[PDB]
């Protein structure tokens, strides 16, 4: 398929995977822990979401040492997944500056080439003429 | 009338609609659910706010399967609405430099035009001379 959907859908697929992993890891890692209600996968499914989008509603979350290492990794994964998609939108914004800067080197380079070239010509004409003022007049 | 307010106001309108939809869907979808206080629209109105701005105070939120699908859609919609306004702040600050750099093109361009066209004025001059030197010295 179109690549812009392959690099965009990828970060989207990699996003889901981690939004399904933290809800897969921070669940079984929350069994037998003080204040560990996050013992269900479907409930942790929403857990990794509020973790990625860094919302932290505060109703479902870990309390273990290993269940927190997986949580922080879901926090950073979110910032990464959206920090890249935001700087990618800039490619289409500052990328229209390229087309504005490139549509500029044209008009400016065009204005020159004429000036110059119309000068090389100014010489030939000027050259032959003089040249015609010679040999011919004499012979 | 304008094209930057129609594309900006559009994402602004599309924003409100979804900010009015989640508070319209996640409300009736939160009736008869464990810990479902989000049964009111005005309370769910603030709900979609903390969801978009990803603050998640944790006092008003869904617990259903369909009420959460609408919630995550409001989470992403927020990031998208502010991630664009941010990349738009860059193109606006980087695009302004293209104007001052485009003016830099005026000083570097129009200066070269007038010069290469001041030499042309000369090129002939010297030619003119030589022409005379002959026609004035020979015939």
């Amino acid at each position, epitope marked *: 398929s179109a690549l812009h959907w392959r690099a965009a859908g990828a970060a989207t697929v990699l996003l889901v995977i981690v939004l399904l992993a933290g809800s897969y890891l921070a669940v079984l890692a929350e069994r037998g822990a003080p204040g560990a209600q996050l013992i269900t996968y479907p409930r942790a499914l929403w857990w990794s979401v509020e973790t990625a989008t860094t919302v932290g509603y505060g109703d479902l979350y870990p309390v273990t040492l290993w269940g927190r290492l997986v949580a922080v990794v879901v926090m950073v994964a979110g910032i990464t997944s959206f920090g890249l998609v935001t700087a990618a939108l800039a490619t289409w914004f500052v990328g229209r500056e390229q087309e504005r800067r490139g549509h500029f080197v044209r008009h400016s380079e065009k204005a020159a080439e004429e000036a110059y070239t119309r000068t090389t*010509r100014a010489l030939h*004409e000027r050259f*032959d*003429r003089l040249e*015609r003022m010679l040999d011919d*007049n004499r012979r | 009338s304008a094209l930057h307010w129609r594309a900006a106001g559009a994402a602004t309108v599309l924003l409100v609609i979804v900010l009015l939809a989640g508070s319209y869907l996640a409300v009736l979808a939160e009736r008869g659910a464990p810990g479902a206080q989000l049964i009111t629209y005005p309370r769910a109105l603030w709900w979609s706010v903390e969801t978009a701005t990803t603050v998640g105070y944790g006092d008003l939120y869904p617990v259903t399967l369909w009420g959460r699908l609408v919630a995550v859609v409001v989470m992403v919609a927020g990031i998208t609405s502010f991630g664009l306004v941010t990349a738009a702040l860059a193109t606006w600050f980087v695009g302004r430099e293209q104007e001052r750099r485009g003016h830099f093109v005026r000083h570097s361009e129009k200066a070269a035009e007038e010069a290469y066209t001041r030499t042309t004025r000369a090129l002939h001059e010297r030619f*003119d001379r030589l022409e005379r030197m002959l026609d004035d010295n020979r*015939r």
Partner: antibody
Amino acid sequence: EVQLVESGGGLVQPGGSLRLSCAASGFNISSYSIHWVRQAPGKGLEWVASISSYYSSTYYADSVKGRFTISADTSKNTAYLQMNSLRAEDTAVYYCARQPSYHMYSWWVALDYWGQGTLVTVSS
Amino acid sequence: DIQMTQSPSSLSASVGDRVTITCRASQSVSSAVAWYQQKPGKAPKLLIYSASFLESGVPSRFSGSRSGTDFTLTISSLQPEDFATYYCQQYYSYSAPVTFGQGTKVEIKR
């Protein structure tokens, strides 16, 4: 067989504009230069422009300047005169004629092959 | 720019006669003049180029001579039809280059 075919002449409301064409026939305008010489109604001879399409150059007499715009097209083989902002006095018999470019002994025979001219007749 | 002064304003004479017209360049014109004959109705006809030689296929009674700045066209033994309107042209300037003289009309007298 070399020849020229001025065309486009006619009547124009004082102020209006016209476009004359000088289709070449025997020579390649390219390596040549075309002249637009006009002649008042019954008066004498006056030249208006010239354009050595070889050296990408154009020329105009003073009697005209911010108005006429000589220009040729070598894709086809014709020289055109774009007479703009025509003035009552501009009416006449616009002929167009040759002269070789600045090249080997040819530039010396003046306008060696004149055309037959058209008649731009401006008037309200 | 170079202008042109041409005499005689209007010339009258019969056949056999010898006609001589003059033209003085308001400026240096390195033998860059040409001689034109325009019979009312048609367009000019090149007679003399370089001010010296004559366009291939022209009557022998035709010629020109350069006087530094003064140019003169002479018709030896004026024929019957050689009557027309004669034009003096300078083609030197680089105000590309054609500038015609007011002209001299030679009307055959009888």
